[PDB]
Amino acid sequence: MDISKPVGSEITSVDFGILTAKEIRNLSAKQITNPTVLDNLGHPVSGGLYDLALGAFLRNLCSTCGLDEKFCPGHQGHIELPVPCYNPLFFNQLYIYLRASCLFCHHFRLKSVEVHRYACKLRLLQYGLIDESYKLDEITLSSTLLNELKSKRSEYVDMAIAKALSDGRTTERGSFTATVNDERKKLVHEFHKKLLSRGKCDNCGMFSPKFRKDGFTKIFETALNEKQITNNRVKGTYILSTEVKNILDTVFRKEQCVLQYVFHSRPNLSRKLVKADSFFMDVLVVPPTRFRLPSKLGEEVHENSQNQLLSKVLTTSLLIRDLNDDLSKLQKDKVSLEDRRVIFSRLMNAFVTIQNDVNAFIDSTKAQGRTSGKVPIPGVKQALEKKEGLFRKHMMGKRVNYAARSVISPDPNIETNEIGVPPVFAVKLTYPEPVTAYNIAELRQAVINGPDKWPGATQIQNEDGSLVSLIGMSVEQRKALANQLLTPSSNVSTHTLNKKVYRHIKNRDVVLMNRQPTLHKASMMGHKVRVLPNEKTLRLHYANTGAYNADFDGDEMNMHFPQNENARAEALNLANTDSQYLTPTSGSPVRGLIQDHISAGVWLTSKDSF
Amino acid sequence: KMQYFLSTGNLVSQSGLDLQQVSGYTVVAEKINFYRFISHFRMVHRGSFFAQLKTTT
Amino acid sequence: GVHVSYDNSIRDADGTLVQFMYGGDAIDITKESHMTQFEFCLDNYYALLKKYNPSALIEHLDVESALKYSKKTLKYRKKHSKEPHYKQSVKYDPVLAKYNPAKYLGSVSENFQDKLESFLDKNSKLFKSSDGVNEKKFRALMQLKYMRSLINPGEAVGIIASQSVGEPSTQMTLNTFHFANVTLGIPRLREIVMTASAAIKTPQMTLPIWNDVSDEQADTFCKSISKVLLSEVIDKVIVTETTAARSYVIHMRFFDNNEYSEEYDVSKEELQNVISNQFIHLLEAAIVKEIKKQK
Amino acid sequence: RPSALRNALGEAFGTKKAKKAIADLERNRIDSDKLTDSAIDIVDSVRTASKDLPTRAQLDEITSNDRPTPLANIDATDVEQIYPIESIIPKKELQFIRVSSILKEADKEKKLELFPYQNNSKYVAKKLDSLTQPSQMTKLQLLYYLSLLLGVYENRRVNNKTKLLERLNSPPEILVDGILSRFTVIKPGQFGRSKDRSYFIDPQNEDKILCYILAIIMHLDNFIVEITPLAHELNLKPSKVVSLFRVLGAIVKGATVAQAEAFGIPKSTAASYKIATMKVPFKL
Amino acid sequence: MYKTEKVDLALNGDPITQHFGFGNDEWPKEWLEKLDEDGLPYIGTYVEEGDPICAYFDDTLNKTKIKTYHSSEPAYIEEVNLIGDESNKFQELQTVSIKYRIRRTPQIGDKFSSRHGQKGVCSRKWPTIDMPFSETGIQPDIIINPHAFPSRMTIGMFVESLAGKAGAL
Amino acid sequence: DRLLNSSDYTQASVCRECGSILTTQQSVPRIGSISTVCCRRCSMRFEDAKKLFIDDSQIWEDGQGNKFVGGNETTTVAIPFVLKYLDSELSAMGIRLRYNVEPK
Amino acid sequence: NENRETARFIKKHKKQVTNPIDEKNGTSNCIVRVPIALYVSLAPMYLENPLQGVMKQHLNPLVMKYNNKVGGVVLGYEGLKILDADPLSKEDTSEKLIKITPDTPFGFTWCHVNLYVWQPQVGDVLEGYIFIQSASHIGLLIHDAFNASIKKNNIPVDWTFVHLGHWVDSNGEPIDGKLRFTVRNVHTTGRVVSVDGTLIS
Amino acid sequence: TTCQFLTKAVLDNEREQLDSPSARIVVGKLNNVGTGSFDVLAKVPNA
Amino acid sequence: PEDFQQHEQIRRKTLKEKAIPKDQRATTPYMTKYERARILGTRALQISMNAPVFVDLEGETDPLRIAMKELAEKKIPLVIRRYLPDGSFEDWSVEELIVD
Amino acid sequence: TATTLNTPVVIHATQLPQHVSTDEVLQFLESFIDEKENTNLSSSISQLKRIQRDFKGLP
RNA sequence: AUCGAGAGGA
DNA sequence: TGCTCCTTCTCCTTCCTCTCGATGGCTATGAGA
DNA sequence: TCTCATAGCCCAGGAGAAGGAGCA
Ligand SMILES: [Zn+2]
Ligand SMILES: [Zn+2]
Ligand SMILES: [Zn+2]
């Protein structure tokens, strides 16, 4: 944080999407297909997992930006897989589209007018007209009148959306709210319930074969009934990933007019046409080395698990490429020999494993395993799901800076809205006080005093963001800085700013006390500072003991020291104890006095008290 | 290997020696005070699988 | 994202509305509970008048719309305070449901205004000792107080409501005075708001009875409504197999007829008909299933 | 034995029985001959998408790698020509290396003035009066270049040129520019170079320079190199030097009676004392 | 408080050249204020964070590296064990065990407990001139909260106090 | 101030024409002028460059010195650094993210 | 889509305008007027003088500063008008109401202003005085404002180099006044911008 | 179950309008409820 | 050039035609604790980074107290832009809000 | 320089660049000197005056 | 410094 | 021809401090006496 | 000519989905 570093831009809204393979080949850093991870015990190999195109690795430079570790974010490489893989994250979804298509005409086995009706329903749901999305079925009566009915439905939807676009019921970017999305998900769920029941083709009476999945691994095909083969002929087992790619590519090429509507919950303004390569992994991205560094202590190295996964991916890829070269050896002719029977199977079994390895790269749960040790190294799914994931460990629950923690102690001599500060916490917690002409003498007093005597100045930061510390400087090197806080405009590029001081805490500031298991908003309140001499703990008044649910047998309170005048005003006004006299639950108080005051009130106001 | 068994506590075997948990059979003596030190010879344990279970029977 | 919008309507952060007023009346709980003790406010009429000064605030707001509108609604809902609400052909909206409640002086809820006028009419003895305190001056003071005790636009009342249910819920998981019926404590509360389950542990129903129905008539109805199982009237089941192929004779000793006749309102020919209809049919179906499940 | 495991299975469980029965529906033959030739056609479509594998023999061995050796002559079966001196020393720099004024002048003060780097190296005093033939004078010039590499090695944190020119006895420009152009990460930019240029050496080229230094020392020590007194001299780590000679193909071995006969070192204390030797081929 | 630090220089068969003491090398002279010439500290010495504890010469960088005391409290040196190898001194000395000692005054905020479960935190050490004094002459050691007795129901502390006064007389 | 500004507050380089924070990088400061952040997603290769003319504004070189062209609409925003981590982690499953950044 | 990429190559890098020679007598009119809009901050320490504050904090530090989005060098700004973010203002008001970012007192807002941009393009005519003399290049004095570089191989053999050296025109007399040359490329190499000059290429 | 809802979000192509408080802090902007529900704007002079 | 002008005019359209007239502003004329706290904090943050002086300093080293002192006399030149769930915003200045 | 405090983020034009002749530019020179009346930046002023002396006949 | 395992505190 | 009830899988969760460990095995080379 | 002696590396807690086993 800096209040002398304003940010001009901002994030306004978030859009999604899927990168494809050729786009990553256009943008990313370097094709990396080298399993060399440890090149003679001390080196990063070029073109490998620790290439300097991927950033910097343990006081090496960069082959992309040529800068230090503190200037490069690390660059994103790309593995070129041998074969196009699935994306498991979307897997079961396209599995439904694996079973809803007619294999011959490349349409869906439901009636074409029915899918046209669902498409018009979802187009009306794109603009908030659920009224139209249930009045659409009003329009009913060879395929000439069927095409007429399609044009009736199309003109009905077009005129309804034109009437919506007449007034301001929907802007140009579309209409989308909660009830709209609920109706959309009900119709998509009913749509997928209907696209798995029609056995025959409703276009030409054919029979698509039966499919069954292993869950993330393979697809098994079943031969159909002899009556079904008889019906197919009069009128018309492991499969590979490329067969799935070719089938779903032709299905998406023939069904663009409806799957433009299914996979979009808004008006698709930029005309993003859905293709098969939106679901597929011909390439894998490669993370920056900076986000993949092994943990180092002196010499001890804990090597990252994603390095192991991605190295196994590259090793399996080069094994598949070597077997591709062996098949290039067989394709001279080599037809009078069954010698290529085994290694081809040693292709296909290995052709399983890379899928499993991608199922071992992103997932760690659903795979096979080399058992009896049961050590799952973390896939990127399991690094995102729990308290030990990312949304709680690093997004919400963050260990903070400029904070303190202690056991506390009673103090009935300070007020209710006050806190007692020991000198050990009064030296290691600073405030970024700027330089201004009204408080210039107090800041020169803090500069003369220094980091060893309360109160004082520790870090004088210049207008370039450069620091000057005082933690080891002498007394006169501090006192010479007294006349060195009124520097004029040297550089006009940074002339409007002034100097800053990370000064010590004093009475004109405010902190935020907290007790760690919280249950309500009055379990975390601001308190006005008073620095105490000869003190080890934090000091508390008894009126706080109702709100924090505190007992003085060894509490543990945290103290966030706020870092902005905005936060000072909010803690001093919006969350001070003076404004928290009552419960928000029922209206009772939680503050007041405790048992010594209570018994003294019993004895004192009695009528034998002269 | 016995130094590994006492320095980590992971019971590593094949038949399991007919038990329930596969870890945590070793306790540091903790001779900070003699009351603690004599408590760590009568301190019996019910089972880590029962500490896992939230049923309060 | 459940907070107080500027129109005092509970919406989500995209405008998805949840309620139109905070509790129906926009009264924050923080400044709530001194709208029940009016005699204390009369006792500090001078202090609450010196605090809430109406002189420096009359120049920004209309004062004579909600008063007339509220007096019209008061006369109408004292005129028809005996018909039920379905027979009540509904007139126009209540007072808060028309006006900005924090702009017009006198835009109050109905129950507060009713208890205000009931307090001002119950204490006719008291205001003769007053200096001239009427319905009007005290009403203007309490309406200025009602305007100054409304909730701010933009308070995290979803968070306040969530914490005000969570914090007294941590005083729970106590096996309370339950046996002297339903699931109690946190296992009730998490069943209600989070899970939304239909399989209630002990689902019940409370039926009010009329006044002419005596206790004997109501308990006769309780013996009428009750579910009766067959094994409730079965003393002994005696199965004697003899293998003519394999066969077995079933002898059932029941109880006395007057016993379940008085307790469960069942004759022996109802017992005959229920052995005739459903028992032997399901028994034969179970025998067929157990025969088929060997192969 | 898998069928015996299934025979124990079918009696054994209901969860492992179902699991391995699913695995047997998973096990079954994933290749037939018509499927084999269809997959041969699909591998021809893999030829169509043949994102080609790297050559892994010349790009991954001859180019920039872990510790780049000097330009080795594997084809030379002569062990004294595995590193020819025209490969290490370029002719462009060799054509202006003249040390006739060094052996011509008899003053050792001016001779140490004419070395580019000045230290307490015992190797300089060991190999100045020992070499007597002028016919190996270019080899002596090689030793000169060795001292010149010291002017790079222990003076690498000098982050510019003119202050690095303040560490040498004003040599001809071509040696220093050849070293700073062949061995350094050239960071371009004239935004600071008109004031002061700033670039340094990555540690991979630093181990390359260590390989060049140890190859020059490998020349001048009868191609049988000392380890432990050199480890006293190099001021570096012992196994570091062992690794640097295992890169350069030097078999770092113990001593027979021949090395006790030659180097004057005791064979009875040679189980831990190391000596680097050479043979004909190249490493793997 | 007693602590233990095992400084080893043999974590990596011959080439360990890190030798204790000092080689023929320059080093800032005020190390002998806290150390001795054999690479060891003076036993019983004021140790504060920012002071060397074990120093040793190595020729691998022509350098005498030290081991700075890294702990928050100021300490003192208790016992310096010097451990050799179990076989017949194939190397010289390479392992130094050091016992630190740290003072602990009874401070404010410390946790003291009686023998009835009633633990507590010493909030302030109260001056004896500010103590309540008895007619016999004495002042108490620990004043305790009297309101803890109804809720916790510790009536046996009365019994222990009365019997202890009886035994003290 | 607390949950963002005091733990991992960071700037970020964004190319507004692509709307991402990760693929942008720093160009090598060559002999002409100072360096400039650029976009790898909005980049013209020297391989084809529609040559089946580029003015001297957008030609820049990476660490090996290959000529790229594009990615000048660059601005710095205020993010947590763990957002950059999550951006680099969601691409491992194959997810593009897109961040609308006004002023457009 | 193959039709998008050709136009995205040839049209977006294509400039706006071309400068003609005045009556084929003088030089080009490379000093052109263009209206721009921008979005800049404002310090509170010049809040009493906010317009000149914006000038001295974003525009006066843009003097003689090259941008490729304007294509050249600005010779001065004119017509600063803040687009106020409050409607019903009608451009005749003094209580302009600028949006403040919720962390800093530097308030960002939109501004229209005109620029007087000097931008040369490919294949143009410029002139230069005698500024320096060397052996193979003469940096010409562009409008008494900039420096012009000349590569050696673009010089025909009719030019007479004499010898410090000097260039002699094909007329044979020493050169004077404003010498004509052709612009090939624009460069920023140096403390300020420069240009690539030619005579036959 | 972040991945399943993220799958459904990508297959819906959710333009997240960024109004939920937890969403606004995962992205990391000034949260809505309180001193972020509105904006302060500066009244400036003319000269 | 011209498409930028068109997007500019669409921006000024959606700004202008989502505005609220001064006749339509019918919220409360009060100032909530959030509004007052934000005004105080933002004005003190301006003064700490040299806002122009319009109130007496009285030698107070606390800029937040200087902000409260300056709020005590309605000297502050700021306008609260109240947003709605539509996004149509009212503008309430300091001069037309009952402080406390 | 990478901060937004000293650098505008968005810069675009709205109209076609009108080729204003040396008349309005000379008028802007004279009125610019007059408005600045009503060192690298002063060297920018000096070069901006040498633009006028350049077109005059004797720089 | 990652994973386990153990201990202890409000 | 089309439409329901009975079985599986397949999913998920209070705060802090300290310590103490943390791959086996299949082959090369390489002297010693 | 084997014996060491090591380098270099390979038991909650229901709710849903989802599809078979019969039925108009
Ligand atoms: Zn880089
Ligand atoms: Zn078909
Ligand atoms: Zn881009």
CATH, residue E51? 2.40.50.150
Question: How many CB atoms lie under 10 A from the CB of residue A509?
Answer: 22
User: What's the rounded Cα separation, in Å, for the pair G21 and G23?
Assistant: 6
User: Tokens 């000198």 belong to which residue?
Assistant: A423
Query: How many inter-chain contacts (C to I, CB under 8 Å) are there?
Result: 36
Residues in A touching D236 (Cβ below 8 Å): none
**From the CA of A46, how far away is ligand 1's center (Å)?**
14
A315 touches strand M (CB under 7 A): no
- The CA–C1' separation of C84 and L28, in angstroms, is 101
In this complex, which of C12, C154, C159 lies closest to H37 when CB atoms are compared? C154
Chain H nearest-CA distance from C126, in A, is 45
CATH assignment, J11-55: 6.10.250.3390
User: What's the rounded Cα separation, in Å, for the pair D277 and D223?
Assistant: 7
Between CA J21 and CA J31, with CA J25 as vertex, the angle to 5 degrees is 150
Contact D119, D149 (CB under 8 A): no
Q: How was this structure determined?
A: cryo-EM
Q: How far is Cα of residue F50 from the mean position of the Cα atoms in its chain?
A: 23
Contact D114, D143 (CB under 8 A): no
User: What's the rounded Cα separation, in Å, for the pair I80 and I87?
Assistant: 14
**From the CA of F74, how far away is ligand 3's center (Å)?**
8
User: What's the rounded Cα separation, in Å, for the pair E47 and C163?
Assistant: 51
Q: Does I4 touch chain H (CB under 8 A)?
A: no
> How far are the Cα atoms of C11, G38, G182 from residue C15, in angstroms, in the given order?
5, 33, 63
Question: Which two three-digit tokens encode residue A311?
Answer: 């190295």
Contact A408, A538 (CB under 8 A): yes
Residue of A nearest to G106 (CA): A6
Give the phi and the psi of residue G24 in degrees, each rounded to 5. Answer: 55, 30
Instruction: For chain H, positions 2-41, list CB contacts with chain A under 8 A.
Output: 2-3, 6-7, 9-18, 22, 25-27, 29, 34-35
Instruction: Identify the structural domains of chain I with CATH numbers, from first to last.
Output: 15-100 (3.90.940.10)
Tell me the resolution in Å: 4.6
User: What's the rounded Cα separation, in Å, for the pair A535 and A527?
Assistant: 18
User: What's the rounded Cα separation, in Å, for the pair A84 and A281?
Assistant: 5
Taking any CB pair shorter than 8 Å as contact, residues of chain C touching chain I are: 5-7, 11, 13-15, 56-57, 60-61, 100, 102-103, 150, 152-154
Protein residues closer than 7 Å by CB to strand L: A 197, 215, 366, 385-387, 399, 405, 516-517, 556; B 3-4, 7-8, 28; D 18, 251, 253-256, 267, 270-271; H 1, 4
What is the 3 state secondary structure string of chain G?
CHHHHHHHHHCCCCCCCCCCEHHHCCCECCEEEEEEEEEECCCHHHCCCHHHHHHHHHHHHHCCCECCCCCCEEEEEEEEEEECCCCCCCCCCCCCEEECCCCCCCCCEEEEEEEEEECCCCCEEEEEECCCCCCCCCCEEECCCEEEEECHHHCCCCCEEECCCEEECCCCCECCCCEEEEEEEEECCCCCCEEEEECCC
Residue from D271, B46, E129, H15 nearest F98 by CA: H15
- Which residues touch A158 (CB under 8 Å, ≥6 apart)? none
Taking any CB pair shorter than 8 Å as contact, residues of chain F touching chain H are: 3-4, 78-80, 83, 90, 93, 95
Q: How far is Cα of residue D111 from the mean position of the Cα atoms in its chain?
A: 31
Chain G nearest-CA distance from A497, in A, is 9
Q: Which domain holds residue A439?
A: 429-505
Residue nearest to nucleotide M11 (CA to C1'): B53
Burial class (CB in 10 A: 0-12, 13-18, 19+), G94: exposed
Amino acid at D171: P
Pick the ligand that lies closest to the CA of residue A69.
1
User: What's the rounded Cα separation, in Å, for the pair C48 and G111?
Assistant: 52
User: What's the rounded Cα separation, in Å, for the pair D110 and I74?
Assistant: 87
User: What's the rounded Cα separation, in Å, for the pair D236 and D217?
Assistant: 15
> How far are the Cα atoms of A284, D51, D163 from residue A78, in angstroms, in the given order?
6, 13, 42
Residue of E nearest to A406 (CA): E109
Within chain C, strands assigned E span 3-4, 10-11, 17-19, 234-242, 247-254
User: What's the rounded Cα separation, in Å, for the pair D25 and C249?
Assistant: 49
User: Tokens 């650094």 belong to which residue?
Assistant: F81
> How far are the Cα atoms of A300, A306, B40, G149 from residue A294, in angstroms, in the given order?
10, 10, 39, 52
- The CA–C1' separation of A45 and M7, in angstroms, is 22
Contact E21, E37 (CB under 8 A): yes
- Quote the DSSP letter at residue A172: T
Question: How many CB atoms lie under 10 A from the CB of residue D159?
Answer: 12
Residues in A touching D40 (Cβ below 8 Å): 327, 330-331
A102 is in an annotated binding site: yes
Topology (CATH level 3) of domain C26-152: Tetracycline Repressor; domain 2 (1.10.357)
> How far are the Cα atoms of A93, A243, A252, H9, H23 from residue A90, in angstroms, in the given order?
6, 18, 16, 11, 23
Query: In this structure, are A295 and A389 located in the same domain?
Result: yes
**From the CA of A242, how far away is ligand 2's center (Å)?**
22
The string over A570-588, giving b where at least 16 C-beta atoms fall within 10 Å of a residue's C-beta and e elsewhere, is bbbbbbbbebbebbbbeee
Residues in A touching D187 (Cβ below 8 Å): 66
Residue from A394, A568, A10 nearest F3 by CA: A394
Q: Do E108 and A409 touch (CB under 8 A)?
A: yes
Please spell the DSSP secondary structure of A206-247, one letter per residue: -BPPEEEE-SSS-EEEE---HHHHHHHHHH--B--HHHHHHH
Question: Which residues on neighbouring strands pair with residue C250, listed in sequence order?
Answer: C239
Q: Does C209 touch chain H (CB under 8 A)?
A: no
A62 is in an annotated binding site: yes
Q: Which domain holds residue E14?
A: 1-105
Question: Which residues on neighbouring strands pair with residue G166, listed in sequence order?
Answer: G162
Query: In this structure, are A363 and A325 located in the same domain?
Result: yes
B53 touches strand M (CB under 7 A): yes
Please spell the DSSP secondary structure of A82-126, one letter per residue: EEEEE-GGGHHHHHHHHHSB-TTTSSBSS-HHHHHHHHHHHHHHT
Instruction: Identify the structural domains of chain F with CATH numbers, from first to last.
Output: 1-103 (3.90.1800.10)
What is the 3 state secondary structure string of chain E?
CEEEEEEECCCCCCCCCCEECCCCCCCCHHHCCCECCCCCECCCCEECCCCEEEEEEECCCCEEEEEECCCCCCEEEEEEEEECCCCCCCCCCCEEEEEEECCCCCCCCCEEECCCCCEEECCCCCCHHHCCCCCCCCCCCCCCCCCHHHHHCCCHHHHHHHHHHHHHC
Contact D184, D113 (CB under 8 A): no
Question: How many CB atoms lie under 10 A from the CB of residue G32?
Answer: 23
> Which bases of strand L have any atom within 7 Å of the beta carbon of a protein residue?
3, 9-17, 20-23, 29-32
C199 touches strand M (CB under 7 A): yes
- Which residues touch A125 (CB under 8 Å, ≥6 apart)? A133, A180, A183, A184, A187
- Quote the DSSP letter at residue C238: E
User: What's the rounded Cα separation, in Å, for the pair A307 and A320?
Assistant: 20
Question: What dihedral do alpha carbons E68, E70, E75, E80 form, nearest 10°?
Answer: -60
A322 is in an annotated binding site: no
Please indicate whether chains E and G are in contact, defined as at least 3 beta carbon pairs under 8 Å: no
Q: Can the peptide bond before residue A410 be classed as cis, meaning omega within 30 degrees of 0? A: no
C197 touches strand M (CB under 7 A): yes
Judged by C1' against the alpha carbon of A375, the nearest nucleotide is: K3
In this complex, which of A508, A566, A574 lies closest to I62 when CB atoms are compared? A508
Residue of F nearest to A358 (CA): F93
How many residues does the structure list for chain A?
610
A120 is in an annotated binding site: no
Mutation target to probe the D interface, by most D beta carbons within 10 A, among F26, F27, F31, F64 is F31
Residue of E nearest to A556 (CA): E109
CATH assignment, G31-118: 3.30.1490.120
User: What's the rounded Cα separation, in Å, for the pair C290 and J38?
Assistant: 111
**Backbone break loci in chain D, preceding residues, C–N > 2.5 A:** none
Question: How many CB atoms lie under 10 A from the CB of residue F82?
Answer: 20
User: What's the rounded Cα separation, in Å, for the pair A440 and I50?
Assistant: 13
- Which residues touch C221 (CB under 8 Å, ≥6 apart)? C209, C213
Residue from F5, F77, F22, H33 nearest A398 by CA: F5
Question: How many CB atoms lie under 10 A from the CB of residue A98?
Answer: 19
- The CA–C1' separation of C289 and M16, in angstroms, is 29
Residues in I touching H42 (Cβ below 8 Å): 77-78
Residue nearest to nucleotide K6 (CA to C1'): B27
Contact G116, I60 (CB under 8 A): no
Within A141-218, strands assigned E span 210-213
Contact F13, A404 (CB under 8 A): no
Contact E99, E78 (CB under 8 A): yes
User: Tokens 């050479």 belong to which residue?
Assistant: D278
Chain D nearest-CA distance from F63, in A, is 9
User: What's the rounded Cα separation, in Å, for the pair D148 and A497?
Assistant: 50
Contact A320, A354 (CB under 8 A): yes
Residue from D85, D211, D209, D82 nearest D139 by CA: D85
A72 is in an annotated binding site: yes
Positive or negative, the CA dihedral C85, C89, C94, C98 is: positive
